[PDB]
Design a protein around this ligand. Sequence first.
Ligand SMILES: *[C@@H]1O[C@H](CO)[C@@H](O)[C@H](O)[C@H]1NC(C)=O
Ligand SMILES: *[C@@H]1O[C@H](CO)[C@@H](O)[C@H](O)[C@H]1NC(C)=O
Lengths: 49, 49
Amino acid sequence: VGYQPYRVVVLSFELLNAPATVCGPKKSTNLIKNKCVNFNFNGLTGTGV
Amino acid sequence: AYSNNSIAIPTNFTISVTTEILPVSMTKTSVDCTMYICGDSTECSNLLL
Ligand SMILES: *[C@@H]1O[C@H](CO)[C@@H](O)[C@H](O)[C@H]1NC(C)=O
Ligand SMILES: *[C@@H]1O[C@H](CO)[C@@H](O)[C@H](O)[C@H]1NC(C)=O
């Protein structure tokens, strides 16, 4: 070990505000409004109405 | 024109009206301790405690 090959993959991320192309496996719930809730829009979280 | 035996006595007069402006009070303000710093976030409020 030390003279054996290693396969290296490095991923570079780019958040931006353009439409998302790669996403996590999270499941999407239905949308509600007129109510103080916790939301998650394309990875952007927060709390509000 | 100073002299040791000379005086000046006014004969007429003028009635003048002047203006003076003085600030008395300023606007009263209030600040929310938590909603300015950690607005709508339970984690940040817990840290602020
Ligand atoms: C001051 O008054 C005297 C008189 O008492 C006069 O002789 C003298 O000239 C006066 N002084 C001046 C500078 O005029
Ligand atoms: C004082 O001034 C007023 C305004 O100019 C004038 O009408 C009046 O005659 C004057 N008085 C005297 C005593 O000069």
